[PDB]
Amino acid sequence: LRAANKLIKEMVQEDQKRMEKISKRVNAIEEVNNNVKLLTEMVMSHSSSEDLMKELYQRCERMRPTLFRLASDTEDNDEALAEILQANDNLTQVINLYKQLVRGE
């Protein structure tokens, strides 16, 4: 009995572990896409809203440990990992466009 229920609580605990991960992936990716879209537009038009652009930059930069951490927690989901690396790549590109611009290119 302490054997069976041990196993159900096992399947249940790991099921919700997949659930939290998916939920964390969604929330992280959606934050990156919004931050990326907005910063990109600003850089586009500025090539003023210095504080506003720098503001978006900080929000982007704070997404670095989030993405690294998650990527670093993908078991055998190469497809999931690719999507997280894709999102990280975009975060790096906007940050570079912004820093470039703030250093006169």
HSE, side-chain direction, 13 A CA sphere, residue 18 = 9
Which SS3 state, helix, strand or coil, does residue 22 take? helix
Annotate the chain with three-state secondary structure.
Answer: CCCHHHHHHHHHHHHHHHHHHHHHHHHHHHHHHHHHHHHHHHHHHCCCCHHHHHHHHHHHHCHHHHHHHHHCCCCCCHHHHHHHHHHHHHHHHHHHHHHHHCCCC
Q: Are 43 and 97 in contact (CB under 8 A)?
A: yes
| Contacts of residue 71, Cβ cutoff 8 Å, sequence gap at least 6 | 81, 84, 85, 88
Q: Does domain 1-105 have CATH number 1.20.58.160?
A: yes
Q: How many residues are given for the chain?
A: 105
* Lookup result for tokens 């907005």: 38
* Six-digit token string for 34: 């919004």
DSSP assignment, residue 76?
A: S
Resolution, given in Å to one decimal, reads 2.4
CA 40, 41, 44, 46: dihedral to nearest 10 degrees?
-110
**What does the alpha-carbon distance between residue 35 and residue 14 come to, in Å, rounded to a whole number?**
32
The residue type at 94: V
Token reading at 80: 């999931």
Question: Domain spans of the chain?
Answer: 1-105
Method used for this model? X-ray
> Which amino acid, 73?
D
